[PDB]
Coordinates of C-alpha atoms and ligand atoms in Angstrom, one line a residue:
Chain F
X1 CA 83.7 -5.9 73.2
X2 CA 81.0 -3.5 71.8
X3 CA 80.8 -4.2 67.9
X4 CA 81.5 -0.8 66.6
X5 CA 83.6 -2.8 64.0
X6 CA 79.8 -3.9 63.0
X7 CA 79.4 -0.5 62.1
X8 CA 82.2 1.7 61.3
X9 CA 83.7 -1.3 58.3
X10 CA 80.3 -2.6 57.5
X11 CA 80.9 -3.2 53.6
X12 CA 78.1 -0.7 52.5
X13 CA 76.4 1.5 54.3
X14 CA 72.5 2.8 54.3
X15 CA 71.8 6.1 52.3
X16 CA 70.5 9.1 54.3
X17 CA 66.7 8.6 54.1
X18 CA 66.9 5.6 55.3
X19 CA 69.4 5.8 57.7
X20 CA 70.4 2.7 59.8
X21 CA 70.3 3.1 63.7
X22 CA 72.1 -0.2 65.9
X23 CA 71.3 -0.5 69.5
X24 CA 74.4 -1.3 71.6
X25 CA 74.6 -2.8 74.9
X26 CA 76.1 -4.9 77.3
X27 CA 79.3 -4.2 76.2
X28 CA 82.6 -2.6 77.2
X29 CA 83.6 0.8 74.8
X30 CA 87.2 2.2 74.3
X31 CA 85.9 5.5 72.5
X32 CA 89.5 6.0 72.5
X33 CA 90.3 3.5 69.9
X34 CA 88.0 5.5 67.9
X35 CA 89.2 9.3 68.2
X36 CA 93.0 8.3 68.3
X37 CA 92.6 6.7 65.3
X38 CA 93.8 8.6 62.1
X39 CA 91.7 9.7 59.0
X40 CA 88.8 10.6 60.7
X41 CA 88.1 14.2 58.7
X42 CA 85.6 14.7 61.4
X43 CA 85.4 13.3 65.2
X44 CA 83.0 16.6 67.2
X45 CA 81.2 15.8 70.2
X46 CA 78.3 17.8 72.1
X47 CA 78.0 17.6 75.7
X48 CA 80.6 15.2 76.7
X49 CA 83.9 15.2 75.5
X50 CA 85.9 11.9 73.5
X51 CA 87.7 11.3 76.9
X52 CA 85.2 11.8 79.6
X53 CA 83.3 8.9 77.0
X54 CA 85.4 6.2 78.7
X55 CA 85.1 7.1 82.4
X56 CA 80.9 7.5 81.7
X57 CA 78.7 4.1 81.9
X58 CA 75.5 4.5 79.4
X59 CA 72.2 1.9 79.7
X60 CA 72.3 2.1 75.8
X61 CA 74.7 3.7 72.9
X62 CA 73.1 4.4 69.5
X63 CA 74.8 4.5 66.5
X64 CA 73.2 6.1 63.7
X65 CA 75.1 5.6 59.6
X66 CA 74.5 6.9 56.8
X67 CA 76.3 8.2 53.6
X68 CA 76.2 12.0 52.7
X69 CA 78.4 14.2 50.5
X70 CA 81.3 15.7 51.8
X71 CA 79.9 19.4 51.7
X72 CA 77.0 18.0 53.8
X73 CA 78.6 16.6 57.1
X74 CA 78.6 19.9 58.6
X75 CA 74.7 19.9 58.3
X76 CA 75.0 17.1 61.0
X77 CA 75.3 19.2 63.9
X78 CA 72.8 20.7 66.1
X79 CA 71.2 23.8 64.9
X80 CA 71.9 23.3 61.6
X81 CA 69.8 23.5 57.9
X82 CA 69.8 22.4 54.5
X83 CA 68.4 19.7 52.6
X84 CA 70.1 16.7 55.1
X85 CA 69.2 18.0 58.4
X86 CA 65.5 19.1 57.1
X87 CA 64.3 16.4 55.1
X88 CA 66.8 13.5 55.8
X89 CA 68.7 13.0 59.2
X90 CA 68.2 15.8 61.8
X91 CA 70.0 15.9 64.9
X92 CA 68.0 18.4 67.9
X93 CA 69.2 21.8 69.0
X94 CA 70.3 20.4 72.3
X95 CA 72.0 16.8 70.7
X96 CA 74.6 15.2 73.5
X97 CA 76.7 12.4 71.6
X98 CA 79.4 12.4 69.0
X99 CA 79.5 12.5 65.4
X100 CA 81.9 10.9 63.2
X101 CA 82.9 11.1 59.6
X102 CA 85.4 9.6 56.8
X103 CA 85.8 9.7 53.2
X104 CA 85.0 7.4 51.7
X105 CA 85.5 7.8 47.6
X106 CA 87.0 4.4 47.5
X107 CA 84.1 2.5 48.9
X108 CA 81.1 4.3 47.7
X109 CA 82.1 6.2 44.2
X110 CA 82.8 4.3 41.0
X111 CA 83.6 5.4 37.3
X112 CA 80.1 6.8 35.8
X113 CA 78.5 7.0 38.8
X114 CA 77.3 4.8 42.2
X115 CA 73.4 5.9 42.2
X116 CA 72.7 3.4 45.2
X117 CA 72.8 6.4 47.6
X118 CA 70.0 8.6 47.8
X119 CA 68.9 11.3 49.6
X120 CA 65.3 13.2 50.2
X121 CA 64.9 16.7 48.0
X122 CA 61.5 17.0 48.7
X123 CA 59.5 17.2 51.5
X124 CA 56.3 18.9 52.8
X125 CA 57.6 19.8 56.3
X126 CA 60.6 19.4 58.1
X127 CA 61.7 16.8 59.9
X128 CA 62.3 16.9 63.4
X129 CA 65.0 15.5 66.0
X130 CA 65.9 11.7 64.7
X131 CA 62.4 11.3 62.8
X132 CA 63.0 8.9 59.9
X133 CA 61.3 9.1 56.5
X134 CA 61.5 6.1 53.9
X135 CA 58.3 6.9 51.8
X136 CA 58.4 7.2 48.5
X137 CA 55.0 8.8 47.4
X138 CA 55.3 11.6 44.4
X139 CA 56.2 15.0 45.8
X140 CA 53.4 17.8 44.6
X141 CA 55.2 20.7 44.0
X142 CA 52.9 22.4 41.9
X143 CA 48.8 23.0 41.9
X144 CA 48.2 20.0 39.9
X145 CA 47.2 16.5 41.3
X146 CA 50.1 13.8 40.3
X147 CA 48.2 10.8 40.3
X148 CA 51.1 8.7 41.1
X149 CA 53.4 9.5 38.3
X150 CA 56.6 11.6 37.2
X151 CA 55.7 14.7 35.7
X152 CA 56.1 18.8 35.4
X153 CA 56.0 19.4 39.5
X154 CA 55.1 16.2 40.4
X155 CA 58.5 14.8 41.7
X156 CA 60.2 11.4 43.3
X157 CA 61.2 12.7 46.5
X158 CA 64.8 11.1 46.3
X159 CA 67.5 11.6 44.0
X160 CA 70.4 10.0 43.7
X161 CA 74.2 11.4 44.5
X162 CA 76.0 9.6 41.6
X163 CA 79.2 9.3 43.4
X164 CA 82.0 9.5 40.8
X165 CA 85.5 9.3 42.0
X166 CA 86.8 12.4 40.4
X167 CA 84.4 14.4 42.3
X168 CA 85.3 17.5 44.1
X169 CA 86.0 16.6 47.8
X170 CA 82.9 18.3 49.0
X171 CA 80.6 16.1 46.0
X172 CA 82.7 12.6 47.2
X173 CA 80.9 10.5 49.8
X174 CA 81.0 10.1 53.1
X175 CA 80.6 8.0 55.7
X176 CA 78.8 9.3 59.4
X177 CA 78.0 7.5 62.6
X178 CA 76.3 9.2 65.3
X179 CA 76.5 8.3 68.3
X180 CA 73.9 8.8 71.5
X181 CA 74.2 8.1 75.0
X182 CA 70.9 7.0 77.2
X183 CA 71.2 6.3 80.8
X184 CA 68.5 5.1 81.9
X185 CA 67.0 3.6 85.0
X186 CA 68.1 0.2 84.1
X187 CA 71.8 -0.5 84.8
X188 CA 74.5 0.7 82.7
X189 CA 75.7 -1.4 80.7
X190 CA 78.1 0.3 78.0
X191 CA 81.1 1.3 79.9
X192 CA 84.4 2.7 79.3
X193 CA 87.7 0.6 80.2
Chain T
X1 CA 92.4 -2.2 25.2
X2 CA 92.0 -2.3 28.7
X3 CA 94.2 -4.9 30.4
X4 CA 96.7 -5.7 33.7
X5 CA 100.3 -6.6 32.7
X6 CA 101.4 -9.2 35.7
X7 CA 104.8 -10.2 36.2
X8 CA 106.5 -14.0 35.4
X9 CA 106.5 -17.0 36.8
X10 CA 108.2 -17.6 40.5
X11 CA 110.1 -20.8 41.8
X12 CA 110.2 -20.4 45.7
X13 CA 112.4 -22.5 48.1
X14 CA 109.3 -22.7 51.2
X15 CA 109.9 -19.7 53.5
X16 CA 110.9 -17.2 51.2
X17 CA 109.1 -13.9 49.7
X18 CA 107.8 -13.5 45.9
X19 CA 106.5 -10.0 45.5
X20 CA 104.7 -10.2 42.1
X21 CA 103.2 -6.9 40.0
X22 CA 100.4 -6.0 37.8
X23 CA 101.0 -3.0 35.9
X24 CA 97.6 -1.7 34.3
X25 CA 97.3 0.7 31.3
X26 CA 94.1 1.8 28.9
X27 CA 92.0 3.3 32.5
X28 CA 92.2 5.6 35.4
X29 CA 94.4 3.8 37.9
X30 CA 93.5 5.6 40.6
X31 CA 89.7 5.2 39.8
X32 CA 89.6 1.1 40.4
X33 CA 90.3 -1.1 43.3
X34 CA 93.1 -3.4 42.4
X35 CA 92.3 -7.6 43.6
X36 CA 94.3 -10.5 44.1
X37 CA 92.5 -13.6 43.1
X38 CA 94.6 -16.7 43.4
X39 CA 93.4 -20.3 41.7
X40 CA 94.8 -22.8 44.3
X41 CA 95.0 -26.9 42.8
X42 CA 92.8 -28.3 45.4
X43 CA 91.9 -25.5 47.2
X44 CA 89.9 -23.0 44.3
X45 CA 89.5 -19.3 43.9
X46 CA 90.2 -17.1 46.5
X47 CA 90.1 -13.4 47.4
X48 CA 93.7 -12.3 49.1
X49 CA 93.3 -8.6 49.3
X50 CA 92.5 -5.2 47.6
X51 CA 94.1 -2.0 47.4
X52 CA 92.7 1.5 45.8
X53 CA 95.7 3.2 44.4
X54 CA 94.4 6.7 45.0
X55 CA 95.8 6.4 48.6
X56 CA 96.9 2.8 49.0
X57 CA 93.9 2.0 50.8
X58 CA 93.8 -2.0 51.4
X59 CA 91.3 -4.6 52.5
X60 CA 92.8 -8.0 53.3
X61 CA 91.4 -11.1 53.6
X62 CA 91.8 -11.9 57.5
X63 CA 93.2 -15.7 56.5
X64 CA 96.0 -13.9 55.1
X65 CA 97.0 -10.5 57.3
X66 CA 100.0 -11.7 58.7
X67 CA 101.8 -13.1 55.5
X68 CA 100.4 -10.6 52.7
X69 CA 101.3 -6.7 51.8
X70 CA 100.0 -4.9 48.5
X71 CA 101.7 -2.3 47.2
X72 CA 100.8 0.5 44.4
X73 CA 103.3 3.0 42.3
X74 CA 101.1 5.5 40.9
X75 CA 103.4 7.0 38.9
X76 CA 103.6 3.4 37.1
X77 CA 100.5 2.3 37.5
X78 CA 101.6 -0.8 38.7
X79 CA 100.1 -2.6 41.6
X80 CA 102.4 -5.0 44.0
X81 CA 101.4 -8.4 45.7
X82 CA 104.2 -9.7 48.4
X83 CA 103.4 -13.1 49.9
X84 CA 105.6 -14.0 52.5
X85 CA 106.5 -17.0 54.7
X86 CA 105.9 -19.4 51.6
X87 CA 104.5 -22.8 51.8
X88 CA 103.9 -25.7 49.2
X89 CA 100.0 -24.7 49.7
X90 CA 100.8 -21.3 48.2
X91 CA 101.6 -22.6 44.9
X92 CA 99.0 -21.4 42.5
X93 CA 97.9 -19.2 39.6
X94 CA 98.0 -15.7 41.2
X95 CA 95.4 -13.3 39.1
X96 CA 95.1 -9.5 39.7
X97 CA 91.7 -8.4 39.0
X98 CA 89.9 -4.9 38.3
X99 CA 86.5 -3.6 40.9
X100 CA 84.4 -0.5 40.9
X101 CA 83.6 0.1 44.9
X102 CA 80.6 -0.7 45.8
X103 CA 80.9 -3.4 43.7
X104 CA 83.4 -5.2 43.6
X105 CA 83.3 -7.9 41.1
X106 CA 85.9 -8.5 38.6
X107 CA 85.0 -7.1 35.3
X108 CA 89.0 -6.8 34.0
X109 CA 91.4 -9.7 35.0
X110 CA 95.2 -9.9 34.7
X111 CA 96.8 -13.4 33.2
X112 CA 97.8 -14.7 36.4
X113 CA 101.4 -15.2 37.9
X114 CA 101.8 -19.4 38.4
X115 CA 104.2 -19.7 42.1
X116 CA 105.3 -22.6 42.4
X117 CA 106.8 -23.2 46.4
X118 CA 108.4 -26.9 45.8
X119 CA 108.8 -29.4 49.4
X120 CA 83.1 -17.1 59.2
X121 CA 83.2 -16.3 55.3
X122 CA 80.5 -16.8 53.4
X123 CA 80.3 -19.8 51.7
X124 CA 79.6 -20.9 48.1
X125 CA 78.0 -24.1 46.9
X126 CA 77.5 -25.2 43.4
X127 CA 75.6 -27.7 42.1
X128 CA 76.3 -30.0 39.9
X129 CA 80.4 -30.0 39.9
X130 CA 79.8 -31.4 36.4
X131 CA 77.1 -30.7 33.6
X132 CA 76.4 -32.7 30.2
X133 CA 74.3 -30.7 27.3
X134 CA 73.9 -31.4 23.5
X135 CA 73.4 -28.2 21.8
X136 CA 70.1 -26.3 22.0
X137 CA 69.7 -27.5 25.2
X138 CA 69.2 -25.0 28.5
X139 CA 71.9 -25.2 30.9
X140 CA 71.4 -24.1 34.5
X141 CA 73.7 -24.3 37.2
X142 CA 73.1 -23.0 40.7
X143 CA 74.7 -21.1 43.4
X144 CA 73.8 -21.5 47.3
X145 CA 75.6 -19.2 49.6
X146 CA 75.8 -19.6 53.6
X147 CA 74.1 -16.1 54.4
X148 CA 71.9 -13.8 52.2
X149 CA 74.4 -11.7 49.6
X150 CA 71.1 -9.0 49.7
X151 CA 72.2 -5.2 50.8
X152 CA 70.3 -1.9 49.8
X153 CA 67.7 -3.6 47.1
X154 CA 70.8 -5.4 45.3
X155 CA 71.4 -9.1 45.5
X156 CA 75.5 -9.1 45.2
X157 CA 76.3 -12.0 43.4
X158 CA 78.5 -12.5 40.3
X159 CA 79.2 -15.1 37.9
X160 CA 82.5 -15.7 36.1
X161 CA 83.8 -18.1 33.0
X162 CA 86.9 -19.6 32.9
X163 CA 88.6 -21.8 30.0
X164 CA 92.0 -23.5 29.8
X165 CA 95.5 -20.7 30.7
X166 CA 92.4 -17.9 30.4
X167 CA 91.5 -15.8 33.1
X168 CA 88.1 -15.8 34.9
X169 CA 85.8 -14.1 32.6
X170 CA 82.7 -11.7 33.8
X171 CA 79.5 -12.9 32.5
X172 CA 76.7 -11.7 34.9
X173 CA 77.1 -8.8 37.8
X174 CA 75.0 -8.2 40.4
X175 CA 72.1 -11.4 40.3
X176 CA 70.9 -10.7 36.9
X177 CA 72.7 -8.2 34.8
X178 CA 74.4 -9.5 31.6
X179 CA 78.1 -8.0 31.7
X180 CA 78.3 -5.9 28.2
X181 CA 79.7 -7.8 25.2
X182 CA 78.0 -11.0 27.1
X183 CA 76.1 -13.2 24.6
X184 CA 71.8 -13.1 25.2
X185 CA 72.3 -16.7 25.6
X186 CA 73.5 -15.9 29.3
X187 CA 71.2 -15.5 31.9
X188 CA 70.7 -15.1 36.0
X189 CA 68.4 -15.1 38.5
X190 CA 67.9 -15.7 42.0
X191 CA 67.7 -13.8 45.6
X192 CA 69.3 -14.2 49.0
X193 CA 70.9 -17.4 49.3
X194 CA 69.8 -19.4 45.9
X195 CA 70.7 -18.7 42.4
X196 CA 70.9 -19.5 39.0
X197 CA 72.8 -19.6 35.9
X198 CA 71.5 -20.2 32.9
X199 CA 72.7 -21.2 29.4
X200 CA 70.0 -21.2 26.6
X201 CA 70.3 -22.4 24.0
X202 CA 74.3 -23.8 25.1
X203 CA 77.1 -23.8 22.3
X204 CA 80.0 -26.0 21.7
X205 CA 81.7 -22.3 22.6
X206 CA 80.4 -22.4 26.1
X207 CA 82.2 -25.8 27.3
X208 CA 84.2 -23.8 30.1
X209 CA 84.0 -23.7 33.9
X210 CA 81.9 -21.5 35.7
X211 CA 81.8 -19.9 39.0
X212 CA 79.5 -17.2 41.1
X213 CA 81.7 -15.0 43.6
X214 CA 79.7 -13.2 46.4
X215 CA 80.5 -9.2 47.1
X216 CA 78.0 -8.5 49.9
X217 CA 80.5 -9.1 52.7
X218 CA 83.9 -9.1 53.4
X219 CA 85.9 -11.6 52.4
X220 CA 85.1 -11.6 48.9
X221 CA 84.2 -15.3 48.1
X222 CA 83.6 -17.9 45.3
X223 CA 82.5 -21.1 45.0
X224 CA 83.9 -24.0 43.8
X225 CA 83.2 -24.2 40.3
X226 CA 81.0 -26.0 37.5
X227 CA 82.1 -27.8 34.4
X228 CA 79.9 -27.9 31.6
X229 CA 80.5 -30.0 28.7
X230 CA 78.9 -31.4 25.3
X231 CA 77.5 -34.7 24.6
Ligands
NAG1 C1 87.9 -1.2 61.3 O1 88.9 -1.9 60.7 C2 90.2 -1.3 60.8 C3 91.2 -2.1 60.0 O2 90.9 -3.5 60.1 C4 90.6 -1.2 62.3 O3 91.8 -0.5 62.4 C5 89.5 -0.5 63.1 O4 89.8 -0.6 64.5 C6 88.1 -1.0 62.8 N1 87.1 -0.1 63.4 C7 86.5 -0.4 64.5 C8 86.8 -1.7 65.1 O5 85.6 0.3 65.0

């Protein structure tokens, strides 16, 4: 009953900046549909396990998506750096939930390049636990002021992946939901079977 | 040349199977999403299914996943279409079509396979179903769809030209951008729900059928056409 079909086949999916988040509630969950459920490359949860999922009863479930490169879902892990978890999507130290990923050459690669996924290469500080960043202002990287334009040290902050589908497995896209749990005081309403 | 090779014509007794092909030669096989695309009389263009040969990956359109199964052989490059179960309603021109993921319009179409069977979705609304222009003129037809066809800063609508035992031909991709080897003449615009074809100045060349096909959304839909003619 939970639409995690809304997510996990939505036809495109958001690039890592601006990663989407949908809250789900009121709603029954078989998380085992998920993990037994083949080509999955990666299925890791922290602090619960894929089976306890189903006997736990949650006020809300998040489910965080996003396309990275292949060589970059390890970055989404607790404890982790690079330019993903630092300036994109950066899961805490102590993250309870599950993350998920898939390839997914044949939806988001395409001969000469699908530039519609981007990701931030510049940033000033790092972000922290599930802060979100969609500005685009010029990155400063040198002494000189930018005044709004491209230029020698004066960066965009995003660049694009190009997917191709002869990549390298670790340069193909993937897709990555991530999944937290909140019980709060109101009732639980994202249960198991 | 780039092209799909699809099988010959089928006569089906209703309730049997026709498993047609499209072999494909000039590209990376493996690098596309193969389509089917039938042209039903009555009924119009719609998407059946998709499958990326790399690993046989499919995507079918939920009005036919009981009766449909694509196939690919890699080592031929040759893509498979079995329809099963048939009925007189299946009769129609069956096209395979080329898509870049992400895409997914048709840029590269197949001849089409006529099957002949004797004894929710977004949808797309065209207006006008017919058009009279004297040359010189501006044409403009437009395109309403159910929903928005907007994702990720793109609008994902396509436009397509079709002309008498000739394939659906890619003329615009993606709202606005003129498909390479696409006269200037051809134009689009639009956002959303509403847009717009348009013809400027039209030649006797473009009297042809015309249809926009959204790819924000699964299924893959079109509308159902606009004739344009000369007077
Ligand atoms: C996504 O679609 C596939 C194929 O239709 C299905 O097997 C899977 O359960 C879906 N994922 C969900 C519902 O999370």
């Amino acid at each position: 009953l939970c639409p995690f079909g809304e997510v996990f086949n939505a036809t495109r999916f958001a690039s890592v900046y601006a990663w989407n988040r949908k809250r789900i509630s009121n709603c029954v969950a078989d998380y085992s549909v998920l993990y037994n459920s083949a080509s999955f490359s990666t299925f890791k949860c922290y602090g619960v396990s894929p089976t306890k999922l189903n006997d736990l009863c949650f006020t809300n479930v998040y489910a965080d998506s996003f396309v990275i490169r292949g060589d970059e879902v390890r970055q989404i892990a607790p404890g982790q750096t690079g330019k993903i978890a630092d300036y994109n999507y950066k899961l805490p130290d102590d993250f309870t939930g599950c993350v998920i990923a898939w390839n997914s050459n044949n939806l988001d690669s395409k001969v000469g390049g699908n530039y519609n996924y981007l990701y931030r290469l510049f940033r000033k500080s790092n972000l922290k636990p599930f802060e979100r960043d969609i500005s685009t202002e010029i990155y400063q990287a040198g002494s000189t002021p930018c005044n709004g334009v491209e230029g020698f040290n004066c960066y965009f902050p995003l660049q694009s992946y190009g997917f191709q589908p002869t990549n390298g497995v670790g340069y193909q896209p993937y897709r990555v939901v991530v999944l937290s749990f909140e019980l709060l005081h109101a009732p639980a309403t994202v249960c198991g079977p | 040349q780039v092209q799909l090779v699809q099988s010959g014509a089928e006569v089906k007794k209703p309730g049997a199977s026709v498993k047609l092909s499209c072999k494909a030669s000039g590209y990376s096989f493996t690098s596309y999403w193969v389509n089917w695309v039938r042209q039903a009389p009555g009924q119009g263009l719609e998407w059946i299914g998709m499958i990326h040969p790399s690993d046989s990956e499919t995507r079918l359109n939920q009005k036919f996943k009981d009766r449909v199964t694509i196939t690919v052989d890699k080592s031929t490059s040759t893509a498979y279409m079995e329809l099963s179960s048939l009925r007189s309603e299946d009769t129609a021109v069956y096209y395979c079509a080329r898509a870049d993921g992400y895409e997914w319009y048709f840029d590269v179409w197949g001849r089409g396979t006529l099957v002949t069977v004797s004894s929710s979705d977004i949808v797309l609304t065209q207006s006008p179903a017919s058009l009279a222009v004297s040359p010189g003129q501006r044409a403009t037809i437009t395109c309403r769809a159910s929903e928005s066809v907007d994702s990720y800063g793109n609008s994902f609508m396509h436009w397509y030209q079709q002309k008498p035992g000739q394939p659906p031909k890619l003329l615009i991709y993606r709202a606005s951008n003129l498909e390479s080897g696409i006269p200037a003449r051809f134009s689009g615009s639009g956002s959303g729900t509403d847009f717009t074809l348009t013809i400027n100045p039209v030649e006797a060349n473009d009297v042809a059928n015309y249809y926009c096909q959204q790819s924000n959304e699964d299924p893959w839909t079109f509308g159902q056409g606009t004739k344009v003619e000369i007077k």
